[PDB]
Amino acid sequence: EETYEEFSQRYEKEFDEAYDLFEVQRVLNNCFSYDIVPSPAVIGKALNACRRVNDYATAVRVFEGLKHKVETKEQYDAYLEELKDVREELGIDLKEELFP
């Protein structure tokens, strides 16, 4: 029943008040559990939340979740072309550039 523009505000508000790594992982886990793929603003707040709690693996796995949530590949490449300044400023590296 909830709309896109209420989902995408409730989750920014939730990401802006988490205090531990447990909380960030919990909020991310049920953000990717709806019918709606999160907008780039929500992911932008999620990366900052992961930065405050000082975790690197989560910032790389948030991008690995988009590859599965998205329907096709053009959409996945469209996400990576709006979240490009944020990545190159924070320092996040995708998994396919690490090959771990």
Binding site: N30, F32, S33, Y34, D35, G65, H68, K69
Partner: protein, 236 residues
């Protein structure tokens, strides 16, 4: 008729009632096949798409339109199945003019047959008893556990009304090709009817359990022409 070695489906029919049974069964299997294919496809899709999945949809738990739809369609299927069943149940029976009567008393481990007509003034009603031919005394070509020393003989294209009763325990009168299956209770008279369209030999077996030699009580019904029936009756 006679059972076939590697059987898969019904026996050949010789009465309208058995054709009705076959048609109703073939009608129901349509919808049953539909339901089975639907369920199997859903399981196949679930296995192929959603095994070891990264995303879990843990908020799709209510449904409102789909619960009407998996409750109304089975109802309409049941109604469609129920219509022809009621028509067949009420329609096919001995509506007009039964033509001949044969009493079949089922004793312990053999059958007894009486022809209620064909009587004289002194009570010489034609009657006999049907036993089973053992393995040791079989001739060349006779079927085992289905062949009897005396066989019922009836005309073709004549209504036959069988009255079933028993004297010892609860037996069952069965002839699968003719579509006849009735019980023989110790203190009541049951009845069934049959019409035969082609000449031949029809074999049958008992149904309800009655003791040691429950597997050795064959029934054998021959359908001959009118002339042969007269010749047979003028000898017994």
């Amino acid at each position: 008729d006679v059972p076939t070695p590697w059987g898969i489906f019904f026996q050949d029919s010789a009465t309208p009632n058995m054709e009705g049974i076959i048609e109703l069964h073939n009608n129901i299997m349509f919808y049953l096949v539909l339901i089975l294919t639907f369920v199997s496809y859903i399981l196949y899709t679930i296995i192929y798409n959603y095994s070891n999945a990264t995303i879990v949809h843990k908020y799709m738990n209510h449904g409102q339109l789909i619960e009407i739809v998996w409750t109304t369609l089975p109802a309409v299927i049941l109604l469609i199945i129920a219509f022809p069943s009621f028509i067949l149940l009420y329609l096919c029976d001995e509506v007009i003019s039964p033509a001949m009567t044969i009493k079949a008393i089922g004793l312990q481990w053999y059958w007894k047959y009486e022809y209620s007509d064909f009587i004289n003034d002194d009570g010489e009603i034609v009657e006999f008893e049907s036993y089973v031919i053992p393995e040791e005394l079989l001739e060349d070509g006779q079927l085992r556990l289905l062949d009897v020393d005396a066989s019922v003989v009836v005309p073709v294209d004549t209504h036959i009304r069988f009255i079933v009763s028993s004297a010892d325990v609860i037996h069952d009168f069965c002839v699968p090709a003719l579509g006849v299956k009735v019980d023989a209770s110790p203190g009541r008279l049951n009845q069934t009817s049959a019409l035969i369209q082609r000449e031949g030999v029809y074999y049958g077996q008992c149904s309800e359990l009655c003791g040691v030699m429950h597997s050795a009580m064959p029934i054998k019904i021959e359908a001959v022409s009118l002339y042969e029936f007269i010749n047979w009756l003028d000898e017994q």
